[PDB]
Design a protein around this ligand. Structure first.
Ligand SMILES: CCCCCCCCCCCCCCCC(=O)O
Ligand SMILES: CCCCCCCCCCCCCCCC(=O)O
Ligand SMILES: CC(=O)N[C@@H]1[C@@H](O)[C@H](O)[C@@H](CO)O[C@H]1O
Ligand SMILES: *[C@@H]1O[C@H](CO)[C@@H](O)[C@H](O)[C@H]1NC(C)=O
Ligand SMILES: OC[C@H]1O[C@H](O)[C@@H](O)[C@@H](O)[C@@H]1O
Ligand SMILES: OC[C@H]1O[C@H](O)[C@@H](O)[C@@H](O)[C@@H]1O
Ligand SMILES: [Ca+2]
Length: 476
């Protein structure tokens, strides 16, 4: 699917090993500290597609599918998929080629997309960089395909970031020499073929900043689908330029201020407000980025605070910002693990309750987004517009006039007081009636044009014109 196709999507990101087992168990042990395969499979995902689709997601992103180093290293097994060795075999822990094709087909039968995580930068190896036996790598079975061994020490030296090896001498990550024609041609042929074989709709590309920029236009072209790159840097001046060589990148610029704004009641609304506008103007296209606050490479949101109101607000922001929402499996069950491996909890141990607070919040936020898009072809390209902030509040507006969603978010938290926010700039016509689609109340725009927004419990408020909901399932 094309970048334009992907603008309207909403992604549930999951670890294949940790989301769902074939046997459907909700009690099978998975201690994150063990760092071992816990048994999640592609077939398991198929059997829980109702759970995922019940939150209003339209797509999944799964972790890499290639065959990995086999060892239990000193950092555990390759359960996460980022230590590949044999790119023409699948990781058989997850199932077979037919299983992966079956997953793709099951998604497509529901009108959903498959996004697959891919690594081009490196292989993985158990042990020191000087000990590598290059014959284990398929097809890159010779040291001639790799950069000379060195570790990355200075992340402000971009040549070293690209030409030296990630990892260390416990688990080393042999760095492909991606300037070589034979390497580029092989990866380009491989990615086009992977996409064809499994009918992949989009790719999430790992470790983009570690491969020189001139590799990526050719790779994105050969893939033939939307590619969203992981450029792990919060500086929009470093990360947004990667959108000149790839369709989208993960919105790490928004991540840090978004997390800070809502992880405590004293978080900065200014920094978030200002970053929305910086990204809007400085990034090639904010609506092709992916918005997140939680993933497998940072502490989960609830590791910072268990306040459920704060968690609802940050999840609403993810869904209603410019770009593609990305929610990380377990976030909807208020998982609170810290840094790797603790943030790789098994989703099945929650029991997959569809009535948890964040499952319902997310479902309501995705419902209004999916619906507004079905009625407003301009929604996905309308640049999200921050219209208000104060010490504990940010409000924003997105969508064609007459059909705009106006979202008011708060970091007051679960003990927040009750009051009425007189919101100007929403752009609704006086006396028009709005539905608050999270809690399902109605408010009326005053004659002065302001919206008197009832605030309470630190709860997020999402407004949409009542008349436009006629015939929808939203709020009765
Ligand atoms: C032309 C693309 C941008 C490159 C430089 C942008 C600098 C922004 C902040 C840097 C982030 C972390 C260190 C990387 C510095 C570098 O560019 O070598
Ligand atoms: C690679 C092609 C684009 C390169 C341009 C990068 C810097 C400019 C970003 C695009 C401008 C979009 C913002 C205008 C919309 C708005 O502010 O409402
Ligand atoms: C379609 C395709 O390339 N399949 C691969 C082939 O390239 C090689 C072979 C060994 O493993 C398989
Ligand atoms: C694509 O499928 C063929 C079998 O039809 C297989 O041999 C090949 O290795 C696959 N390529 C990739 C990149 O998975
Ligand atoms: O085309 C790449 C080709 O290189 C080698 O022959 C093997 O690893 C094959 O599996 C692979 O497909
Ligand atoms: O392009 C396929 C081809 O790529 C490289 O040249 C080698 O790894 C071969 O084994 C194969
Ligand atoms: Ca590299």
């Amino acid at each position: 699917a094309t970048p334009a196709d992907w603008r309207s999507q909403s992604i549930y990101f999951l670890l294949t090993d940790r989301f769902a087992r074939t046997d459907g168990s909700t009690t099978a042990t998975c201690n994150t500290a063990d760092q071992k395969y816990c048994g999640g499979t592609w077939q398991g995902i198929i059997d829980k597609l109702d759970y995922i689709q019940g939150m209003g997601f339209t797509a999944i992103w799964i972790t890499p599918v290639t065959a990995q180093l086999p060892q239990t290293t000193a950092y555990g097994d390759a359960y996460h998929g980022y230590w590949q060795q044999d790119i023409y075999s699948l990781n058989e822990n997850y199932g077979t080629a037919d299983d992966l094709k079956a997953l793709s087909s099951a998604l497509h039968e529901r009108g959903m997309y498959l996004m697959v995580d891919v690594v081009a930068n490196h292989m993985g190896y158990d042990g020191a960089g000087s000990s590598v036996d290059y014959s284990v790598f398929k097809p890159f079975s010779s040291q001639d395909y790799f950069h000379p061994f060195c570790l990355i020490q200075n992340y402000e030296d971009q040549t070293q970031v690209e030409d030296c090896w990630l990892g260390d001498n416990t688990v080393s990550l042999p760095d492909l020499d991606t300037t070589k024609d034979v390497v580029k041609n092989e990866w380009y042929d491989w990615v086009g073929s992977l996409v064809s074989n499994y009918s992949i709709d989009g790719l999430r590309i790992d470790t983009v900043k570690h491969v020189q920029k001139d590799f990526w236009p050719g790779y994105n072209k050969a893939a033939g689908v939307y590619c969203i790159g992981e450029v792990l840097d919060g500086d929009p001046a470093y990360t947004c330029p990667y959108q000149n060589v790839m369709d989208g990148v993960l919105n790490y610029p928004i991540y840090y201020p978004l997390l800070n704004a809502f992880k405590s009641t004293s978080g900065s609304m200014d920094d978030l407000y200002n970053m929305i506008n910086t990204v809007k103007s400085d990034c090639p296209d904010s609506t092709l980025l992916g918005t997140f606050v939680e993933n497998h490479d940072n502490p989960r949101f609830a590791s910072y605070t268990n306040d459920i109101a704060l968690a609802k607000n940050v999840a609403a922001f993810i869904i209603l910002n410019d770009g593609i929402p990305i929610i990380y499996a377990g976030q909807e069950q208020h998982y609170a693990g810290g840094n790797d491996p603790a943030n790789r909890e098994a989703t099945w141990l929650s029991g997959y309750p569809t009535d948890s607070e964040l499952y319902k919040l997310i479902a309501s936020a995705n419902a209004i987004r999916n619906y507004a898009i079905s009625k407003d072809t301009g929604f996905v390209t309308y640049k999200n517009w921050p219209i208000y902030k104060d010490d504990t509040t940010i409000a924003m507006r997105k969508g064609t006039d007459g059909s705009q969603i106006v979202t008011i978010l708060s970091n007051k938290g679960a003990s927040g007081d009750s009051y009425t926010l007189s919101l100007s700039g929403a752009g609704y016509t006086a006396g028009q009636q709005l539905t608050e689609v999270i809690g399902c109340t109605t408010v009326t725009v005053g004659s002065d044009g302001n919206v008197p927004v009832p605030m309470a419990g630190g709860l997020p408020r999402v407004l949409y014109p009542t008349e436009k909901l006629a015939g929808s399932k939203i709020c009765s």
